Enzyme design. Sequence first.
Site, PDB file in Angstrom:
ATOM      1  N   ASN A  44       0.834  -1.194   0.000  1.00  0.00           N
ATOM      2  CA  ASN A  44       0.000   0.000   0.000  1.00  0.00           C
ATOM      3  C   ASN A  44       0.871   1.247   0.000  1.00  0.00           C
ATOM      4  O   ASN A  44       1.868   1.340   0.717  1.00  0.00           O
ATOM      5  CB  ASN A  44      -0.895  -0.018   1.241  1.00  0.00           C
ATOM      6  CG  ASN A  44      -1.953   1.060   1.247  1.00  0.00           C
ATOM      7  OD1 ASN A  44      -2.437   1.444   2.316  1.00  0.00           O
ATOM      8  ND2 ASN A  44      -2.347   1.539   0.078  1.00  0.00           N
ATOM      9  N   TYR A  77      -7.762  14.023  -0.093  1.00  0.00           N
ATOM     10  CA  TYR A  77      -7.518  13.171   1.088  1.00  0.00           C
ATOM     11  C   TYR A  77      -6.951  14.020   2.208  1.00  0.00           C
ATOM     12  O   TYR A  77      -6.059  14.848   2.009  1.00  0.00           O
ATOM     13  CB  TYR A  77      -6.521  12.082   0.688  1.00  0.00           C
ATOM     14  CG  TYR A  77      -5.907  11.302   1.816  1.00  0.00           C
ATOM     15  CD1 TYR A  77      -6.669  10.555   2.696  1.00  0.00           C
ATOM     16  CD2 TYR A  77      -4.524  11.294   1.992  1.00  0.00           C
ATOM     17  CE1 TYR A  77      -6.084   9.838   3.727  1.00  0.00           C
ATOM     18  CE2 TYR A  77      -3.934  10.588   3.010  1.00  0.00           C
ATOM     19  CZ  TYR A  77      -4.720   9.856   3.878  1.00  0.00           C
ATOM     20  OH  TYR A  77      -4.116   9.148   4.897  1.00  0.00           O
ATOM     21  N   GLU A  86     -10.272  10.597   9.038  1.00  0.00           N
ATOM     22  CA  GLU A  86      -9.588  10.492   7.736  1.00  0.00           C
ATOM     23  C   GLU A  86     -10.658  10.530   6.641  1.00  0.00           C
ATOM     24  O   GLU A  86     -11.608   9.742   6.682  1.00  0.00           O
ATOM     25  CB  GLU A  86      -8.848   9.150   7.693  1.00  0.00           C
ATOM     26  CG  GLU A  86      -8.009   8.922   6.457  1.00  0.00           C
ATOM     27  CD  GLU A  86      -7.263   7.594   6.510  1.00  0.00           C
ATOM     28  OE1 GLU A  86      -7.884   6.596   6.927  1.00  0.00           O
ATOM     29  OE2 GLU A  86      -6.070   7.571   6.152  1.00  0.00           O
ATOM     30  N   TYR A  88     -11.933  11.095   2.392  1.00  0.00           N
ATOM     31  CA  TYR A  88     -11.623  10.826   1.014  1.00  0.00           C
ATOM     32  C   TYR A  88     -12.767  11.348   0.103  1.00  0.00           C
ATOM     33  O   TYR A  88     -13.900  10.911   0.268  1.00  0.00           O
ATOM     34  CB  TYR A  88     -11.529   9.323   0.737  1.00  0.00           C
ATOM     35  CG  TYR A  88     -10.585   8.540   1.593  1.00  0.00           C
ATOM     36  CD1 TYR A  88     -10.935   8.131   2.874  1.00  0.00           C
ATOM     37  CD2 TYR A  88      -9.336   8.164   1.102  1.00  0.00           C
ATOM     38  CE1 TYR A  88     -10.060   7.395   3.653  1.00  0.00           C
ATOM     39  CE2 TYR A  88      -8.462   7.428   1.875  1.00  0.00           C
ATOM     40  CZ  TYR A  88      -8.827   7.049   3.144  1.00  0.00           C
ATOM     41  OH  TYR A  88      -7.951   6.311   3.913  1.00  0.00           O
ATOM     42  N   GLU A 178      -3.072   6.745  -4.747  1.00  0.00           N
ATOM     43  CA  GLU A 178      -2.874   5.545  -3.933  1.00  0.00           C
ATOM     44  C   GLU A 178      -2.739   4.324  -4.848  1.00  0.00           C
ATOM     45  O   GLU A 178      -3.358   4.260  -5.901  1.00  0.00           O
ATOM     46  CB  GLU A 178      -4.060   5.342  -2.986  1.00  0.00           C
ATOM     47  CG  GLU A 178      -3.947   4.172  -2.048  1.00  0.00           C
ATOM     48  CD  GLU A 178      -4.619   2.908  -2.509  1.00  0.00           C
ATOM     49  OE1 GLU A 178      -5.013   2.799  -3.685  1.00  0.00           O
ATOM     50  OE2 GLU A 178      -4.736   1.964  -1.685  1.00  0.00           O
TER      51      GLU A 178
END
Length: 194
Positions: A44, A77, A86, A88, A178
């Site tokens: 990741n 983000y 968090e 998105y 990402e």
Amino acid sequence: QTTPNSEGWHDGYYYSWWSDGGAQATYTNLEGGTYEISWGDGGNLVGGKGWNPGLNARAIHFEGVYQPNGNSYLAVYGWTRNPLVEYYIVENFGTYDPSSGATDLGTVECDGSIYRLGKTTRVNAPSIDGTQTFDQYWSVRQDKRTSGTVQTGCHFDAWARAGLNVNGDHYYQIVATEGYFSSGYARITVADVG
């Protein structure tokens, strides 16, 4: 190899670069609001440029090259604190929708498309502030694109109407690319067009 984790200022913009160390990846800050990521299989990774602090209402423009091969997303983000969140706003994604499994909070229309809203909770997970419990807010664009303007206020208002807390103290707010066990290349330029 892999560019070491890094966070800070570059050319007037904030940036964040993070990977789990399992992927092969090179992250480079270019001039102004531009960054470049090249990645291969293994893990990741997430990086990008923007601002710190974020705003509930910023007109964010992005453009450039986005060429994932597999699991990947391109999103606005960021984080808030108090509460720790968090969030998105996902503008494009490779194969799977990263919000899969989130609790469905309905839809909203922002910047020319319907977005699906959702929320999930991460328990004892890695955060900007160490191992913590925190929510993730999701807004996922139906009509995928690689350039355009995001008015973040449209999404924050939507999350608020669904009953989510959007009053936290803003940390960073970036346009992130990402990858997750995939390969790809991205060269993205961000700007505030308010």
